[PDB]
């Protein structure tokens, strides 16, 4: 694939660690299911035909992975000659020792058959130096909702009836913190033998770290022919963990 | 912003 005449003024590479953390918790707060899907994407502009050693802290427990076709399998880490441009290096999955960036603590209080009292607290759980962002919390309402009143100190919240959820949104929030929201759900009457099974509360967030604790140790570039070595390459790395399915039962 | 430098 990768031709041989590749020459660049700046020999740069950018390492993207993209993780998707999935969690199902009890209202109590017990984890009922949790895994992390991951991939590592490389965007590089290096001259020649480079030999690349990618090094991480495999420490962490990685539970399977599939590679791209130019990988010398045999720590044993990964050596490879990368296509120019952008390509996916490896793709892994984790279930042990996962950082769960947010705890969602729900509280519901019936009031006759008219009202429903709802309080939901999110607890960020990471380095306070670090900011989660793009935070959304989804709280389903019943179908016989007549109307919804909400208050929250941080961020904004509307009741979307088309969707039967209260959607609370928070632009940023630092590790080890708390925010809470409170709603009064005004109810219509309905078929009383049919009770309301409480759908889970779901969250979406983005965090500048990998919730699987994968770190990147080294990416050593070796050029035999051309007169640049490893400590010449500008290297950059970011981690972007996002919520997959992330639901607290209630 | 983008990234932070490898180290």
PDB file of C-alpha atoms in Angstrom:
ATOM      1  CA  UNK A   1       0.000   0.000   0.000  1.00  0.00           C
ATOM      2  CA  UNK A   2       2.369   2.691   1.377  1.00  0.00           C
ATOM      3  CA  UNK A   3       4.637   3.945  -1.443  1.00  0.00           C
ATOM      4  CA  UNK A   4       8.348   4.625  -0.896  1.00  0.00           C
ATOM      5  CA  UNK A   5       8.844   8.302  -1.797  1.00  0.00           C
ATOM      6  CA  UNK A   6       7.458  10.027   1.310  1.00  0.00           C
ATOM      7  CA  UNK A   7       9.282  13.136   2.544  1.00  0.00           C
ATOM      8  CA  UNK A   8       7.983  15.688   5.072  1.00  0.00           C
ATOM      9  CA  UNK A   9       9.257  18.956   6.472  1.00  0.00           C
ATOM     10  CA  UNK A  10       7.771  18.277   9.939  1.00  0.00           C
ATOM     11  CA  UNK A  11       7.778  14.578  10.929  1.00  0.00           C
ATOM     12  CA  UNK A  12       4.728  14.497  13.171  1.00  0.00           C
ATOM     13  CA  UNK A  13       2.379  11.841  14.540  1.00  0.00           C
ATOM     14  CA  UNK A  14      -0.818  12.035  16.624  1.00  0.00           C
ATOM     15  CA  UNK A  15      -2.011   9.121  18.801  1.00  0.00           C
ATOM     16  CA  UNK A  16      -5.742   8.886  19.563  1.00  0.00           C
ATOM     17  CA  UNK A  17      -6.958   6.531  22.286  1.00  0.00           C
ATOM     18  CA  UNK A  18     -10.715   6.260  21.836  1.00  0.00           C
ATOM     19  CA  UNK A  19     -12.632   4.445  24.544  1.00  0.00           C
ATOM     20  CA  UNK A  20     -16.306   3.786  25.017  1.00  0.00           C
ATOM     21  CA  UNK A  21     -17.244   2.852  28.608  1.00  0.00           C
ATOM     22  CA  UNK A  22     -20.437   0.855  29.189  1.00  0.00           C
ATOM     23  CA  UNK A  23     -22.099   0.423  32.587  1.00  0.00           C
ATOM     24  CA  UNK A  24     -25.355  -0.844  34.080  1.00  0.00           C
ATOM     25  CA  UNK A  25     -25.732  -0.085  37.793  1.00  0.00           C
ATOM     26  CA  UNK A  26     -28.377  -0.810  40.425  1.00  0.00           C
ATOM     27  CA  UNK A  27     -30.200   2.008  42.242  1.00  0.00           C
ATOM     28  CA  UNK A  28     -28.349   0.783  45.335  1.00  0.00           C
ATOM     29  CA  UNK A  29     -25.123   1.396  43.394  1.00  0.00           C
ATOM     30  CA  UNK A  30     -23.922  -2.113  42.582  1.00  0.00           C
ATOM     31  CA  UNK A  31     -22.321  -2.618  39.185  1.00  0.00           C
ATOM     32  CA  UNK A  32     -24.430  -5.096  37.200  1.00  0.00           C
ATOM     33  CA  UNK A  33     -22.408  -4.972  33.929  1.00  0.00           C
ATOM     34  CA  UNK A  34     -19.467  -2.898  32.731  1.00  0.00           C
ATOM     35  CA  UNK A  35     -16.978  -3.119  29.888  1.00  0.00           C
ATOM     36  CA  UNK A  36     -14.877  -0.802  27.748  1.00  0.00           C
ATOM     37  CA  UNK A  37     -14.575  -0.970  23.978  1.00  0.00           C
ATOM     38  CA  UNK A  38     -11.434   0.691  22.683  1.00  0.00           C
ATOM     39  CA  UNK A  39      -9.434   1.517  19.604  1.00  0.00           C
ATOM     40  CA  UNK A  40      -6.158   3.308  18.892  1.00  0.00           C
ATOM     41  CA  UNK A  41      -6.030   5.488  15.763  1.00  0.00           C
ATOM     42  CA  UNK A  42      -2.797   6.886  14.380  1.00  0.00           C
ATOM     43  CA  UNK A  43      -2.497  10.033  12.292  1.00  0.00           C
ATOM     44  CA  UNK A  44       1.136  10.388  11.176  1.00  0.00           C
ATOM     45  CA  UNK A  45       3.277  12.305   8.627  1.00  0.00           C
ATOM     46  CA  UNK A  46       6.679  10.622   8.757  1.00  0.00           C
ATOM     47  CA  UNK A  47       9.251  10.402   5.991  1.00  0.00           C
ATOM     48  CA  UNK A  48      10.442   7.108   4.557  1.00  0.00           C
ATOM     49  CA  UNK A  49       9.407   3.576   5.571  1.00  0.00           C
ATOM     50  CA  UNK A  50       9.344   3.792   9.363  1.00  0.00           C
ATOM     51  CA  UNK A  51       9.450   0.922  11.826  1.00  0.00           C
ATOM     52  CA  UNK A  52       7.089   1.784  14.672  1.00  0.00           C
ATOM     53  CA  UNK A  53       7.097   0.204  18.128  1.00  0.00           C
ATOM     54  CA  UNK A  54       3.909   1.059  20.035  1.00  0.00           C
ATOM     55  CA  UNK A  55       4.206   0.613  23.788  1.00  0.00           C
ATOM     56  CA  UNK A  56       1.545   0.708  26.512  1.00  0.00           C
ATOM     57  CA  UNK A  57       0.979  -0.743  29.987  1.00  0.00           C
ATOM     58  CA  UNK A  58      -0.651  -4.051  29.039  1.00  0.00           C
ATOM     59  CA  UNK A  59      -0.381  -2.241  34.081  1.00  0.00           C
ATOM     60  CA  UNK A  60      -3.921  -3.066  32.857  1.00  0.00           C
ATOM     61  CA  UNK A  61      -5.917  -6.165  31.899  1.00  0.00           C
ATOM     62  CA  UNK A  62      -6.880  -6.160  28.183  1.00  0.00           C
ATOM     63  CA  UNK A  63      -9.461  -8.884  27.459  1.00  0.00           C
ATOM     64  CA  UNK A  64      -9.154  -9.266  23.609  1.00  0.00           C
ATOM     65  CA  UNK A  65      -8.166  -7.327  20.455  1.00  0.00           C
ATOM     66  CA  UNK A  66      -7.936  -7.450  16.635  1.00  0.00           C
ATOM     67  CA  UNK A  67      -5.064  -5.785  14.731  1.00  0.00           C
ATOM     68  CA  UNK A  68      -4.416  -4.125  11.404  1.00  0.00           C
ATOM     69  CA  UNK A  69      -2.600  -6.282   8.881  1.00  0.00           C
ATOM     70  CA  UNK A  70       0.960  -4.836   9.117  1.00  0.00           C
ATOM     71  CA  UNK A  71       1.552  -5.811  12.782  1.00  0.00           C
ATOM     72  CA  UNK A  72       4.475  -7.978  13.907  1.00  0.00           C
ATOM     73  CA  UNK A  73       2.592  -9.720  16.702  1.00  0.00           C
ATOM     74  CA  UNK A  74       5.565 -10.568  18.973  1.00  0.00           C
ATOM     75  CA  UNK A  75       6.669  -7.045  27.148  1.00  0.00           C
ATOM     76  CA  UNK A  76       5.696  -8.264  23.746  1.00  0.00           C
ATOM     77  CA  UNK A  77       4.216  -5.074  22.264  1.00  0.00           C
ATOM     78  CA  UNK A  78       3.439  -3.974  18.712  1.00  0.00           C
ATOM     79  CA  UNK A  79       5.842  -3.200  15.880  1.00  0.00           C
ATOM     80  CA  UNK A  80       4.514  -2.022  12.533  1.00  0.00           C
ATOM     81  CA  UNK A  81       5.135   0.073   9.424  1.00  0.00           C
ATOM     82  CA  UNK A  82       2.281   2.570   9.296  1.00  0.00           C
ATOM     83  CA  UNK A  83       0.403   3.729   6.211  1.00  0.00           C
ATOM     84  CA  UNK A  84       0.703   7.412   5.500  1.00  0.00           C
ATOM     85  CA  UNK A  85      -2.291   9.419   6.656  1.00  0.00           C
ATOM     86  CA  UNK A  86      -4.657   8.016   9.244  1.00  0.00           C
ATOM     87  CA  UNK A  87      -5.334   4.401  10.198  1.00  0.00           C
ATOM     88  CA  UNK A  88      -6.514   2.261  13.119  1.00  0.00           C
ATOM     89  CA  UNK A  89      -3.692   0.433  14.846  1.00  0.00           C
ATOM     90  CA  UNK A  90      -5.443  -1.906  17.319  1.00  0.00           C
ATOM     91  CA  UNK A  91      -8.903  -2.441  18.789  1.00  0.00           C
ATOM     92  CA  UNK A  92      -9.357  -3.909  22.277  1.00  0.00           C
ATOM     93  CA  UNK A  93     -11.924  -4.596  25.027  1.00  0.00           C
ATOM     94  CA  UNK A  94     -11.720  -4.425  28.855  1.00  0.00           C
ATOM     95  CA  UNK A  95     -13.818  -5.588  31.798  1.00  0.00           C
ATOM     96  CA  UNK A  96     -11.548  -5.355  34.866  1.00  0.00           C
ATOM     97  CA  UNK A  97     -10.475  -2.375  36.977  1.00  0.00           C
ATOM     98  CA  UNK A  98     -12.486   0.185  35.010  1.00  0.00           C
ATOM     99  CA  UNK A  99     -12.791   3.819  36.113  1.00  0.00           C
ATOM    100  CA  UNK A 100     -16.474   4.731  36.200  1.00  0.00           C
ATOM    101  CA  UNK A 101     -16.321   8.496  35.633  1.00  0.00           C
ATOM    102  CA  UNK A 102     -19.777   9.231  37.082  1.00  0.00           C
ATOM    103  CA  UNK A 103     -22.093   7.873  39.767  1.00  0.00           C
ATOM    104  CA  UNK A 104     -25.808   8.564  39.269  1.00  0.00           C
ATOM    105  CA  UNK A 105     -27.856   8.450  42.414  1.00  0.00           C
ATOM    106  CA  UNK A 106     -31.618   8.560  41.839  1.00  0.00           C
ATOM    107  CA  UNK A 107     -34.360   9.186  44.384  1.00  0.00           C
ATOM    108  CA  UNK A 108     -38.112   8.929  43.768  1.00  0.00           C
ATOM    109  CA  UNK A 109     -41.021   9.814  46.070  1.00  0.00           C
ATOM    110  CA  UNK A 110     -44.624   9.191  45.053  1.00  0.00           C
ATOM    111  CA  UNK A 111     -47.196  11.740  46.108  1.00  0.00           C
ATOM    112  CA  UNK A 112     -50.701  10.334  46.074  1.00  0.00           C
ATOM    113  CA  UNK A 113     -51.400   9.863  42.399  1.00  0.00           C
ATOM    114  CA  UNK A 114     -50.783  13.486  41.324  1.00  0.00           C
ATOM    115  CA  UNK A 115     -47.092  14.232  41.833  1.00  0.00           C
ATOM    116  CA  UNK A 116     -43.780  12.408  41.621  1.00  0.00           C
ATOM    117  CA  UNK A 117     -40.811  13.771  43.512  1.00  0.00           C
ATOM    118  CA  UNK A 118     -37.507  13.163  41.780  1.00  0.00           C
ATOM    119  CA  UNK A 119     -33.948  14.033  42.805  1.00  0.00           C
ATOM    120  CA  UNK A 120     -30.928  12.905  40.787  1.00  0.00           C
ATOM    121  CA  UNK A 121     -27.303  13.465  41.795  1.00  0.00           C
ATOM    122  CA  UNK A 122     -24.249  12.919  39.612  1.00  0.00           C
ATOM    123  CA  UNK A 123     -20.871  12.378  41.311  1.00  0.00           C
ATOM    124  CA  UNK A 124     -17.819  12.912  39.120  1.00  0.00           C
ATOM    125  CA  UNK A 125     -15.008  10.595  40.047  1.00  0.00           C
ATOM    126  CA  UNK A 126     -11.613  11.471  38.601  1.00  0.00           C
ATOM    127  CA  UNK A 127      -8.688  13.895  38.895  1.00  0.00           C
ATOM    128  CA  UNK A 128     -10.200  17.327  39.755  1.00  0.00           C
ATOM    129  CA  UNK A 129      -7.519  18.794  37.546  1.00  0.00           C
ATOM    130  CA  UNK A 130      -9.525  17.154  34.730  1.00  0.00           C
ATOM    131  CA  UNK A 131     -12.790  18.314  33.156  1.00  0.00           C
ATOM    132  CA  UNK A 132     -15.549  16.107  31.854  1.00  0.00           C
ATOM    133  CA  UNK A 133     -17.526  17.821  29.141  1.00  0.00           C
ATOM    134  CA  UNK A 134     -20.555  17.263  26.913  1.00  0.00           C
ATOM    135  CA  UNK A 135     -22.475  15.925  29.916  1.00  0.00           C
ATOM    136  CA  UNK A 136     -26.111  14.905  29.454  1.00  0.00           C
ATOM    137  CA  UNK A 137     -28.442  13.142  31.878  1.00  0.00           C
ATOM    138  CA  UNK A 138     -31.637  11.564  30.615  1.00  0.00           C
ATOM    139  CA  UNK A 139     -34.523  10.996  33.008  1.00  0.00           C
ATOM    140  CA  UNK A 140     -37.601   9.303  31.586  1.00  0.00           C
ATOM    141  CA  UNK A 141     -41.055  10.503  32.593  1.00  0.00           C
ATOM    142  CA  UNK A 142     -44.216   8.378  32.490  1.00  0.00           C
ATOM    143  CA  UNK A 143     -46.616   8.584  29.598  1.00  0.00           C
ATOM    144  CA  UNK A 144     -49.474  10.118  31.594  1.00  0.00           C
ATOM    145  CA  UNK A 145     -47.224  13.042  32.524  1.00  0.00           C
ATOM    146  CA  UNK A 146     -49.324  16.185  32.606  1.00  0.00           C
ATOM    147  CA  UNK A 147     -46.354  18.454  33.254  1.00  0.00           C
ATOM    148  CA  UNK A 148     -42.898  18.812  34.722  1.00  0.00           C
ATOM    149  CA  UNK A 149     -41.185  21.402  36.938  1.00  0.00           C
ATOM    150  CA  UNK A 150     -37.412  21.215  37.389  1.00  0.00           C
ATOM    151  CA  UNK A 151     -34.596  23.037  39.179  1.00  0.00           C
ATOM    152  CA  UNK A 152     -30.856  22.623  38.794  1.00  0.00           C
ATOM    153  CA  UNK A 153     -27.962  24.757  40.004  1.00  0.00           C
ATOM    154  CA  UNK A 154     -25.563  23.706  37.211  1.00  0.00           C
ATOM    155  CA  UNK A 155     -26.427  23.478  33.520  1.00  0.00           C
ATOM    156  CA  UNK A 156     -29.852  23.529  31.901  1.00  0.00           C
ATOM    157  CA  UNK A 157     -32.838  21.163  31.747  1.00  0.00           C
ATOM    158  CA  UNK A 158     -36.036  20.904  29.702  1.00  0.00           C
ATOM    159  CA  UNK A 159     -38.799  18.312  29.738  1.00  0.00           C
ATOM    160  CA  UNK A 160     -39.117  16.859  26.235  1.00  0.00           C
ATOM    161  CA  UNK A 161     -42.563  15.308  25.906  1.00  0.00           C
ATOM    162  CA  UNK A 162     -41.990  14.079  22.338  1.00  0.00           C
ATOM    163  CA  UNK A 163     -39.308  11.897  24.008  1.00  0.00           C
ATOM    164  CA  UNK A 164     -40.805  11.431  27.544  1.00  0.00           C
ATOM    165  CA  UNK A 165     -37.561  12.388  29.236  1.00  0.00           C
ATOM    166  CA  UNK A 166     -36.167  15.259  31.201  1.00  0.00           C
ATOM    167  CA  UNK A 167     -32.899  16.123  29.487  1.00  0.00           C
ATOM    168  CA  UNK A 168     -30.352  17.853  31.737  1.00  0.00           C
ATOM    169  CA  UNK A 169     -27.194  19.185  30.028  1.00  0.00           C
ATOM    170  CA  UNK A 170     -23.923  20.375  31.622  1.00  0.00           C
ATOM    171  CA  UNK A 171     -21.137  21.941  29.549  1.00  0.00           C
ATOM    172  CA  UNK A 172     -18.256  21.018  31.847  1.00  0.00           C
ATOM    173  CA  UNK A 173     -17.642  19.545  35.278  1.00  0.00           C
ATOM    174  CA  UNK A 174     -14.452  18.789  37.187  1.00  0.00           C
ATOM    175  CA  UNK A 175     -13.503  15.553  38.900  1.00  0.00           C
ATOM    176  CA  UNK A 176     -14.646  14.759  42.416  1.00  0.00           C
ATOM    177  CA  UNK A 177     -17.695  17.070  42.462  1.00  0.00           C
ATOM    178  CA  UNK A 178     -21.464  16.875  42.750  1.00  0.00           C
ATOM    179  CA  UNK A 179     -24.412  18.367  40.925  1.00  0.00           C
ATOM    180  CA  UNK A 180     -28.020  17.504  41.466  1.00  0.00           C
ATOM    181  CA  UNK A 181     -31.325  18.138  39.747  1.00  0.00           C
ATOM    182  CA  UNK A 182     -34.859  18.021  41.115  1.00  0.00           C
ATOM    183  CA  UNK A 183     -38.183  17.599  39.337  1.00  0.00           C
ATOM    184  CA  UNK A 184     -41.851  17.535  40.277  1.00  0.00           C
ATOM    185  CA  UNK A 185     -43.673  15.327  37.803  1.00  0.00           C
ATOM    186  CA  UNK A 186     -47.348  16.142  37.528  1.00  0.00           C
ATOM    187  CA  UNK A 187     -49.379  13.073  36.542  1.00  0.00           C
ATOM    188  CA  UNK A 188     -52.616  12.448  34.676  1.00  0.00           C
ATOM    189  CA  UNK A 189     -54.755   9.452  35.670  1.00  0.00           C
ATOM    190  CA  UNK A 190     -54.326   6.118  33.900  1.00  0.00           C
ATOM    191  CA  UNK A 191     -54.976   2.364  34.206  1.00  0.00           C
ATOM    192  CA  UNK A 192     -53.962   1.834  37.838  1.00  0.00           C
ATOM    193  CA  UNK A 193     -53.425  -1.943  37.709  1.00  0.00           C
ATOM    194  CA  UNK A 194     -50.736  -1.235  35.121  1.00  0.00           C
ATOM    195  CA  UNK A 195     -47.952   0.250  37.284  1.00  0.00           C
ATOM    196  CA  UNK A 196     -44.995   2.216  35.840  1.00  0.00           C
ATOM    197  CA  UNK A 197     -41.809   0.198  35.453  1.00  0.00           C
ATOM    198  CA  UNK A 198     -39.037   2.843  35.939  1.00  0.00           C
ATOM    199  CA  UNK A 199     -36.776   2.915  32.837  1.00  0.00           C
ATOM    200  CA  UNK A 200     -33.138   3.578  33.716  1.00  0.00           C
ATOM    201  CA  UNK A 201     -31.513   6.952  33.915  1.00  0.00           C
ATOM    202  CA  UNK A 202     -28.878   7.277  31.203  1.00  0.00           C
ATOM    203  CA  UNK A 203     -25.885   9.593  30.986  1.00  0.00           C
ATOM    204  CA  UNK A 204     -23.622  10.804  28.256  1.00  0.00           C
ATOM    205  CA  UNK A 205     -20.245  12.378  28.960  1.00  0.00           C
ATOM    206  CA  UNK A 206     -16.742  12.854  27.532  1.00  0.00           C
ATOM    207  CA  UNK A 207     -13.506  12.644  29.522  1.00  0.00           C
ATOM    208  CA  UNK A 208      -9.843  13.431  28.740  1.00  0.00           C
ATOM    209  CA  UNK A 209      -8.690  10.052  30.000  1.00  0.00           C
ATOM    210  CA  UNK A 210      -9.191   6.395  29.186  1.00  0.00           C
ATOM    211  CA  UNK A 211     -11.575   4.818  31.728  1.00  0.00           C
ATOM    212  CA  UNK A 212      -9.752   1.492  31.166  1.00  0.00           C
ATOM    213  CA  UNK A 213      -6.537   2.968  32.531  1.00  0.00           C
ATOM    214  CA  UNK A 214      -4.603   2.118  29.397  1.00  0.00           C
ATOM    215  CA  UNK A 215      -1.666   4.482  29.055  1.00  0.00           C
ATOM    216  CA  UNK A 216       0.740   4.878  26.156  1.00  0.00           C
ATOM    217  CA  UNK A 217       4.365   4.350  27.159  1.00  0.00           C
ATOM    218  CA  UNK A 218       6.347   4.813  23.926  1.00  0.00           C
ATOM    219  CA  UNK A 219       6.017   5.130  20.156  1.00  0.00           C
ATOM    220  CA  UNK A 220       9.570   4.713  18.876  1.00  0.00           C
ATOM    221  CA  UNK A 221      10.160   5.550  15.202  1.00  0.00           C
ATOM    222  CA  UNK A 222      13.260   4.062  13.575  1.00  0.00           C
ATOM    223  CA  UNK A 223      14.450   5.245  10.158  1.00  0.00           C
ATOM    224  CA  UNK A 224      17.445   3.312   8.819  1.00  0.00           C
ATOM    225  CA  UNK A 225      17.959   5.008   5.477  1.00  0.00           C
ATOM    226  CA  UNK A 226      17.062   8.620   6.188  1.00  0.00           C
ATOM    227  CA  UNK A 227      18.961  10.848   8.604  1.00  0.00           C
ATOM    228  CA  UNK A 228      16.297  11.272  11.264  1.00  0.00           C
ATOM    229  CA  UNK A 229      16.001   9.266  14.472  1.00  0.00           C
ATOM    230  CA  UNK A 230      13.395   8.740  17.166  1.00  0.00           C
ATOM    231  CA  UNK A 231      14.012  11.841  19.253  1.00  0.00           C
ATOM    232  CA  UNK A 232      13.340  13.947  16.110  1.00  0.00           C
ATOM    233  CA  UNK A 233       9.670  13.028  15.704  1.00  0.00           C
ATOM    234  CA  UNK A 234       7.071  15.359  17.175  1.00  0.00           C
ATOM    235  CA  UNK A 235       4.684  13.064  19.062  1.00  0.00           C
ATOM    236  CA  UNK A 236       1.253  13.879  20.475  1.00  0.00           C
ATOM    237  CA  UNK A 237      -1.322  11.815  22.341  1.00  0.00           C
ATOM    238  CA  UNK A 238      -4.867  12.364  23.491  1.00  0.00           C
ATOM    239  CA  UNK A 239      -7.338  10.141  25.320  1.00  0.00           C
ATOM    240  CA  UNK A 240     -11.057  10.483  24.583  1.00  0.00           C
ATOM    241  CA  UNK A 241     -13.247   8.203  26.634  1.00  0.00           C
ATOM    242  CA  UNK A 242     -16.923   8.537  25.898  1.00  0.00           C
ATOM    243  CA  UNK A 243     -20.003   6.988  27.393  1.00  0.00           C
ATOM    244  CA  UNK A 244     -21.385   4.014  25.553  1.00  0.00           C
ATOM    245  CA  UNK A 245     -24.538   2.739  27.214  1.00  0.00           C
ATOM    246  CA  UNK A 246     -24.309   4.137  30.736  1.00  0.00           C
ATOM    247  CA  UNK A 247     -27.432   3.564  32.810  1.00  0.00           C
ATOM    248  CA  UNK A 248     -28.324   3.570  36.498  1.00  0.00           C
ATOM    249  CA  UNK A 249     -31.394   1.482  37.256  1.00  0.00           C
ATOM    250  CA  UNK A 250     -33.944   3.129  39.525  1.00  0.00           C
TER     251      UNK A 250
ATOM    252  CA  UNK B   1      -8.095  21.765  22.016  1.00  0.00           C
ATOM    253  CA  UNK B   2      -6.183  18.885  20.355  1.00  0.00           C
ATOM    254  CA  UNK B   3      -3.534  16.848  22.217  1.00  0.00           C
ATOM    255  CA  UNK B   4      -0.726  17.011  24.761  1.00  0.00           C
ATOM    256  CA  UNK B   5       2.871  16.044  23.967  1.00  0.00           C
ATOM    257  CA  UNK B   6       4.045  12.511  24.501  1.00  0.00           C
ATOM    258  CA  UNK B   7       5.947  11.878  27.783  1.00  0.00           C
TER     259      UNK B   7
END
